[PDB]
Amino acid sequence: GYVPKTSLSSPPWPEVVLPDPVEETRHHAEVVKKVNEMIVTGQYGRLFAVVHFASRQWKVTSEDLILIGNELDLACGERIRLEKVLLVGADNFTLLGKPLLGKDLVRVEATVIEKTESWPRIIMRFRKRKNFKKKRIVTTPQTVLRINSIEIAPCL
Amino acid sequence: TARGTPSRFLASVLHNGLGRYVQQLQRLSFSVSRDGASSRGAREFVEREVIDFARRNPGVVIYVNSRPCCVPRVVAEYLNGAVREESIHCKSVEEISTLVQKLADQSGLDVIRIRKPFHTDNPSIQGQWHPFTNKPTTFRGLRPREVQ
Amino acid sequence: KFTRSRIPEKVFQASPEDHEKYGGDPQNPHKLHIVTRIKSTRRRPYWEKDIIKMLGLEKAHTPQVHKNIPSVNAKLKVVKHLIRIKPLKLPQGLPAEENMSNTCLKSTGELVVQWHLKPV
Amino acid sequence: GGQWRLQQGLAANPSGYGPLTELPDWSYADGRPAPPMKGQLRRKAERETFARRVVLLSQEMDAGLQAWQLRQQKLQEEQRKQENA
Amino acid sequence: SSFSRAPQQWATFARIWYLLDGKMQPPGKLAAMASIRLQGLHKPVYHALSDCGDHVVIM
Amino acid sequence: LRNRVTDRYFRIQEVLKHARHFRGRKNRCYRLAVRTVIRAFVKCTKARYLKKKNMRTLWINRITAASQEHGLKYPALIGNLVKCQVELNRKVLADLAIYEPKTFKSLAALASRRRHEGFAAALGDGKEPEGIFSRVVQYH
Amino acid sequence: RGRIPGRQWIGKHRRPRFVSLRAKQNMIRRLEIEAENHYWLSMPYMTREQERGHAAVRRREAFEAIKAAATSKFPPHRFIADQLDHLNVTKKWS
């Protein structure tokens, strides 16, 4: 089952040889340990998180504002722990869940600043030659969250 | 529409969420009529649900004028300087209360289009993309078709 | 003239090969069907439109549970080209009064009762 | 997207069922749980209804079968007894 | 990143010059790449309104 | 005349307010304005659907661009991420590509690894370890 | 030059459409699905004489509810209180 060197004997692509799983595992463990150490030391500087709120995914940091188009039914100034941090990253290392990270690992805090209505949004139907002409004005309710803090723990 | 309406960006006056959530509402000014169906709901509110509201939020300082007004208004003055002035004309008590609550909750800024539902002071933590990220350095800083 | 098509009964008979290919057994046949509307009624004959509505298959990709019986199967045969059918197979026991709340159809048609969102 | 995601039993689309959506999105900073999400409740209700329907289907068929069996038994009884005397 | 704002912005944008040698190549197989470069579709910053296109030298 | 309209100006103004910034008589003459304004409104309603599509296309373009800088194609990347159970949406991925490039690079690498694993699996029809970055977290 | 008769797609002469790979694939998947469906249909539970009456009480009940609904349907209750309240349009304080 041999073929001499031609354009279609071997693949166009290069052959990758993936490493031994035991060694690989060890390497992974080592990497994890390093990360843990870093976390312990406070060697990081500012984190970010891709959090899941209201079916949307948001890359978020301490001090930023996020506008969610609906009522949360919270008084303003109340503090919230956002679950579903499916990415948490920084300079020098990042952590992604499968898909969500655990609650022990990370937590994101958010203060509700304001609850509002959107500017009036105009719905309006029309059809040619057929006396069909509708017009509905709407104001979708909104909330403004200020993400205060991303705490990250040495659980790894 | 968005082309007609003046636009805006998302912000929060004086960084409310960072330190302390500050009630942006300063004053509610209630123009009411003693006589007139225009302001029955308003009257009711004044009687029963206004005091409670006041108690709930002491940063707000309510005024009630009773000024033979043909159409009652509630003037909401905010911390930035903006004045949201809205009518109370022939509204039910509950509705009025809701309106008041809404006024209390919201910030001083204009109710216009917002452009992005987010706003970071410091977006990049690793580094913003220049074209020379994900580009390898060559020896002696050389470039295509050079001498030495 | 386009007409309401009647299918020969040899079409609906599973061979050993067929059995091998799919999961089902000829003895102990599954009790219930998960019937899902995968194709629009629009552009099909009105009787087919009727049939779908009778089965309650109004929202596409939203599934219904029908008895597997000759009566129900005759309707299903009429709109077989509009629907995807799979056996409701319950790995755990079928929902008792304590476990009425926690369930989950999933893919692979299995009902479940022990539904905790935490991993193994 | 993911048709791979049907091979593992995780829905076609990840928004429908699983821990990315059925899990609660937020909680209080004090460590108290949020009230039930509005859509989630609806979903739960739907699920319950489905379950009930399934149960009904399971029972009724069984009952019918039992009835049939009983009828058969009765018929059998009628036979042999009739034949005697 | 560090950086002051304007300089950072400049860095992010700025038209780079690229080179292509022909010689035995098909035109249009060159042009696909070249066109892309011209448009600025090779940048994750791309928009039709931003004007992020780069320079393409072909020899 | 018993009752004729006193308030008609205001109705006229309502439409002309929305027509102020149009070119030519469309902004002055009520008849012409009305047709234009209605058309604009219609466009606005339609445009909501268009906007969403456009944004997603833009994000895909950006991600493609980013992926090519690491020697990967968009579809490969997305598929591998899906396989991994990393379910970052395309807005977010585009953001990552722009603002957090090392993370993007890492993601790309992961995707590549996944692809490689898949390829490996394809050779030997069945068994043994399935590979390290493959496998799936089972929820019950 | 490259022109066809009136309305591309109908009549005697029309623009030739050709079958793509994608289309074929789509067709094939559908066919596969249908095969599976057919197979599923193939194995009934009861065989008909064992589902003669299982429905009937439930069905009757269902019918009956509907009937009741149809029947229990005439003018609503009118009361004094609402009328009295209508006088509150002149509640004038002191």
Side-chain angles (χ1 to χ4, degrees):
Chain A
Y2 162 74
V3 184
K5 180 174 132 195
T6 66
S7 67
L8 307 179
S9 55
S10 60
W13 61 84
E15 189 191 328
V16 308
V17 178
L18 296 165
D20 297 314
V22 176
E23 290 192 333
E24 185 134 65
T25 47
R26 194 189 298 178
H27 185 25
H28 293 334
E30 287 166 22
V31 169
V32 171
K33 182 162 182 172
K34 282 185 177 181
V35 171
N36 223 124
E37 285 164 6
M38 285 170 67
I39 290 162
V40 169
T41 47
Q43 261 205 110
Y44 60 57
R46 179 166 263 128
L47 310 170
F48 61 73
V50 184
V51 190
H52 188 281
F53 210 134
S55 318
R56 280 169 283 285
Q57 292 168 19
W58 314 69
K59 93 129 194 181
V60 206
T61 61
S62 59
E63 312 221 293
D64 91 339
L65 300 176
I66 270 174
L67 175 138
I68 320 185
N70 66 177
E71 263 205 327
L72 298 176
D73 287 299
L74 291 164
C76 282
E78 291 194 64
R79 299 191 61 85
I80 314 169
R81 180 191 201 285
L82 313 190
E83 332 307 13
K84 309 188 174 169
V85 283
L86 34 68
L87 204 298
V88 169
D91 196 352
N92 310 108
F93 73 104
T94 67
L95 314 181
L96 15 159
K98 281 182 164 191
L100 310 182
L101 294 170
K103 290 202 174 184
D104 61 316
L105 217 183
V106 182
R107 127 266 191 73
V108 173
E109 289 261 318
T111 37
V112 189
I113 296 179
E114 55 170 332
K115 310 177 80 175
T116 67
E117 276 178 11
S118 66
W119 70 319
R121 291 179 156 266
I122 305 160
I123 304 152
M124 219 279 182
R125 269 80 219 248
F126 188 60
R127 295 170 181 171
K128 301 166 173 183
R129 302 174 271 92
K130 272 137 179 197
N131 197 32
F132 187 81
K133 184 206 206 194
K134 303 175 158 211
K135 195 248 204 170
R136 161 128 106 86
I137 297 158
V138 200
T139 50
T140 53
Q142 288 174 9
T143 43
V144 179
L145 300 200
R146 177 140 243 160
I147 282 81
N148 299 126
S149 58
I150 309 176
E151 286 165 16
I152 186 173
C155 309
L156 251 165
Chain B
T1 57
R3 298 268 262 201
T5 314
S7 79
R8 155 166 167 274
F9 264 117
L10 208 184
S12 301
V13 184
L14 209 198
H15 305 69
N16 302 34
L18 294 189
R20 322 161 146 195
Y21 167 52
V22 176
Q23 259 266 33
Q24 304 300 261
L25 215 215
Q26 299 196 256
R27 294 177 281 284
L28 290 179
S29 313
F30 280 76
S31 55
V32 195
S33 89
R34 211 266 314 289
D35 313 303
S38 61
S39 70
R40 185 184 63 203
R43 276 203 231 85
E44 265 208 64
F45 181 81
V46 170
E47 195 160 49
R48 72 215 291 283
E49 290 209 64
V50 73
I51 290 159
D52 293 38
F53 166 79
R55 285 172 183 188
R56 274 173 262 155
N57 47 7
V60 183
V61 40
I62 295 90
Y63 296 70
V64 183
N65 283 267
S66 181
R67 53 149 88 268
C69 211
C70 217
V71 178
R73 287 168 229 293
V74 64
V75 192
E77 301 198 22
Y78 289 123
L79 272 179
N80 341 349
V83 182
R84 182 145 279 102
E85 189 159 34
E86 311 198 37
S87 64
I88 330 181
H89 187 72
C90 307
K91 288 186 149 182
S92 71
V93 181
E94 294 98 69
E95 205 311 291
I96 290 163
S97 192
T98 61
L99 208 183
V100 167
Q101 235 292 331
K102 190 244 246 53
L103 282 169
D105 218 293
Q106 69 166 253
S107 193
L109 298 95
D110 294 305
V111 297
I112 52 172
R113 187 178 68 106
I114 294 176
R115 308 170 80 159
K116 308 172 187 166
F118 37 78
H119 181 239
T120 71
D121 267 297
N122 290 281
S124 177
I125 290 148
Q126 290 155 50
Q128 192 182 77
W129 186 89
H130 12 94
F132 298 110
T133 40
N134 341 323
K135 274 191 182 198
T137 56
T138 51
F139 193 88
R140 210 185 299 285
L142 293 164
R143 41 172 158 76
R145 285 56 164 78
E146 268 273 47
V147 182
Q148 293 177 335
Chain C
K1 286 148 71 269
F2 173 71
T3 51
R4 194 169 337 205
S5 61
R6 179 172 24 71
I7 310 142
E9 204 156 39
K10 293 168 184 176
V11 166
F12 295 87
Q13 291 196 66
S15 305
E17 277 181 55
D18 291 18
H19 278 280
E20 285 150 23
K21 191 180 179 189
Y22 304 111
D25 296 32
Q27 298 90 24
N28 304 347
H30 71 309
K31 284 179 284 185
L32 309 177
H33 289 191
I34 309 160
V35 198
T36 326
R37 204 193 73 179
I38 63 170
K39 187 91 154 281
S40 195
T41 48
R42 243 163 156 190
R43 314 210 117 93
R44 294 288 139 209
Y46 72 99
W47 60 84
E48 281 160 47
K49 288 202 177 60
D50 271 288
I51 291 281
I52 286 290
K53 293 170 77 174
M54 297 178 183
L55 298 159
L57 288 170
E58 304 160 71
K59 277 200 175 189
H61 312 302
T62 304
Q64 263 289 2
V65 184
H66 269 311
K67 296 180 192 178
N68 158 51
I69 35 162
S71 305
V72 178
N73 301 342
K75 273 165 264 278
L76 271 21
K77 278 182 259 205
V78 172
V79 292
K80 70 200 161 150
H81 56 286
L82 306 177
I83 63 187
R84 207 156 169 207
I85 301 162
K86 284 193 180 172
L88 175 53
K89 44 178 172 189
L90 308 102
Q92 300 128 55
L94 71 95
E97 277 282 309
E98 195 170 311
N99 313 330
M100 292 261 50
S101 189
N102 287 358
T103 49
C104 251
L105 242 175
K106 303 175 76 193
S107 307
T108 78
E110 23 222 307
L111 217 171
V112 189
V113 292
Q114 295 142 2
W115 188 243
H116 313 290
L117 298 163
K118 298 181 75 61
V120 305
Chain D
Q3 205 264 3
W4 172 91
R5 211 142 37 193
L6 292 174
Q7 311 299 65
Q8 320 307 333
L10 304 168
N13 98 108
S15 82
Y17 110 92
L20 204 149
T21 58
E22 296 182 79
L23 226 60
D25 301 85
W26 63 274
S27 299
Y28 294 108
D30 295 27
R32 323 200 308 284
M37 293 269 295
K38 220 131 182 168
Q40 243 288 61
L41 282 178
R42 145 165 75 73
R43 195 113 42 64
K44 280 172 183 166
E46 285 167 30
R47 280 185 165 102
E48 244 203 286
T49 60
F50 177 109
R52 278 175 176 163
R53 175 73 129 66
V54 167
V55 170
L56 276 189
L57 298 215
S58 70
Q59 284 164 324
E60 272 192 305
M61 293 258 289
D62 290 35
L65 288 161
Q66 296 234 346
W68 183 72
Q69 286 195 11
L70 280 170
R71 283 204 299 283
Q72 288 217 324
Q73 283 181 329
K74 283 176 182 180
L75 285 176
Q76 282 194 313
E77 281 188 5
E78 290 271 316
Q79 285 208 317
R80 299 202 75 174
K81 288 205 173 189
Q82 200 78 17
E83 288 291 312
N84 296 341
Chain E
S1 70
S2 314
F3 294 51
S4 20
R5 290 189 180 282
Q8 171 60 107
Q9 160 265 288
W10 192 286
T12 235
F13 304 135
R15 308 186 224 166
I16 291 195
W17 291 61
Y18 292 74
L19 220 206
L20 272 160
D21 171 59
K23 272 279 181 188
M24 301 307 313
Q25 279 179 94
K29 210 141 198 195
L30 273 165
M33 306 207 313
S35 70
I36 287 157
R37 221 97 341 187
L38 284 176
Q39 278 175 78
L41 285 167
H42 71 284
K43 307 193 178 173
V45 180
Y46 167 59
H47 217 56
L49 301 178
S50 62
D51 188 10
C52 61
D54 289 348
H55 284 262
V56 182
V57 180
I58 312 189
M59 58 136 88
Chain F
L1 314 306
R2 275 210 36 74
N3 20 16
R4 48 160 173 177
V5 175
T6 56
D7 210 73
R8 199 186 327 222
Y9 162 82
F10 288 84
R11 297 165 212 180
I12 296 290
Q13 207 61 11
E14 263 185 336
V15 176
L16 288 163
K17 99 199 165 183
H18 290 313
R20 296 272 89 254
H21 69 105
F22 307 171
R23 273 189 54 191
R25 324 229 287 302
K26 288 146 233 145
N27 80 241
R28 302 186 284 285
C29 309
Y30 175 79
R31 179 199 274 244
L32 304 170
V34 165
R35 291 169 208 175
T36 313
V37 165
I38 287 157
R39 286 218 67 213
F41 283 27
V42 170
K43 284 181 181 223
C44 172
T45 75
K46 288 178 179 163
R48 272 168 263 276
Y49 294 107
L50 294 186
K51 187 190 185 197
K52 291 163 189 169
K53 185 187 176 183
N54 295 342
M55 288 292 313
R56 183 183 206 200
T57 58
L58 180 261
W59 299 327
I60 292 166
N61 292 336
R62 287 178 177 187
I63 294 171
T64 301
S67 66
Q68 289 282 20
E69 290 183 67
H70 306 289
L72 264 178
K73 299 182 176 183
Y74 164 82
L77 161 62
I78 295 291
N80 316 144
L81 285 167
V82 169
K83 294 175 195 169
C84 281
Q85 309 184 329
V86 176
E87 295 185 340
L88 305 185
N89 104 112
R90 315 267 162 75
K91 184 235 287 198
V92 156
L93 263 142
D95 297 348
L96 288 172
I98 295 135
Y99 291 104
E100 295 161 356
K102 312 180 190 185
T103 310
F104 195 99
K105 181 179 183 67
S106 70
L107 284 176
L110 205 208
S112 81
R113 274 231 36 216
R114 232 313 314 199
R115 231 257 215 77
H116 290 320
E117 290 204 26
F119 283 146
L123 284 176
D125 285 37
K127 284 193 173 189
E128 291 172 20
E130 264 307 340
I132 199 79
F133 278 89
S134 190
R135 320 213 214 85
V136 280
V137 176
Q138 315 300 6
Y139 296 109
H140 74 288
Chain G
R1 176 187 151 82
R3 208 219 73 153
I4 54 181
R7 169 72 65 170
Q8 294 192 55
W9 274 131
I10 63 94
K12 179 172 192 176
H13 301 243
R14 50 231 265 172
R15 197 235 278 209
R17 209 227 158 75
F18 304 95
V19 183
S20 57
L21 247 174
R22 275 174 179 160
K24 274 182 174 178
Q25 287 171 0
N26 291 350
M27 266 280 284
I28 290 156
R29 58 180 61 173
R30 271 188 251 146
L31 285 163
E32 287 156 357
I33 282 170
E34 289 180 46
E36 192 185 40
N37 272 354
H38 266 80
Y39 166 73
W40 283 133
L41 279 155
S42 315
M43 44 168 68
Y45 201 77
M46 286 182 135
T47 80
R48 193 155 272 278
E49 314 318 290
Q50 317 193 40
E51 42 108 295
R52 223 49 195 33
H54 74 284
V57 170
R58 181 253 285 191
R59 301 187 83 267
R60 217 110 108 281
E61 233 78 293
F63 181 51
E64 277 170 327
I66 292 161
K67 200 208 292 282
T71 58
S72 299
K73 192 201 81 170
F74 80 177
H77 289 58
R78 331 188 56 72
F79 10 87
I80 294 167
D82 291 10
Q83 182 182 72
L84 289 198
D85 213 32
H86 190 63
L87 298 178
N88 301 6
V89 300
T90 55
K91 189 197 293 187
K92 325 294 275 197
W93 270 22
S94 61

